[PDB]
Ligand SMILES: O=C(/C=C/c1ccc(O)c(O)c1)OCCc1ccccc1
């Protein structure tokens with residue numbers, strides 16, 4: 001099913017999401033609906049709070065070389081924690097919850113996270129470049145943080161101007 005995506009400035013997006021403890025059919029249904037919703041809106045990442053579900057889970061599916069998203073490439077990241085962070089880089093970001101707006105954010109250039117997949121299997125994943133940015137952006141959502149919160153002095157006013 002398609003889910004409604006919640007947009008700025010909804011206070012729902014300020015919610016701190018809760019750890020998932022039951023990795024069951026309902027969880028899988030929600031993840032499937034998140035995927036359907038993300039793809040229908042042409043997104044590459046989605047956190048559960050963006051569809052109103054305050055759970056610490058997010059999906060990321062980056063396009064391959066022909067610009068196509070293959071389902072087998074989708075990461076389902078549940079209960080993530082950072083193990084390591086490194087470096088710094090600027091990256092131009094957007095967000096399904098802030099549609100039509102894009103701006104550079106400073107992110108770690110490399111991250112290592114630990115998380116669980118939909119079968120509760122523990123994973124460790126190292127990421128750089130776009131994947132690292134997507135991981136940081138989506139984890140920020142779980143903590144009630146939007147990328148526009150991270151903009152500089154100069155950039156928020158451009159954001160408010162475009163508003
Ligand atoms: O999927 C997205 C957002 C997509 C989107 C779709 C329609 C829009 O009208 C829009 O304005 C944005 O963002 C995911 C997070 C992200 C952002 C930047 C880099 C890495 C990861």
Ligand SMILES: [Co+2]
Nearest residue numbers: 094095096097
């Ligand atoms: Co987002």
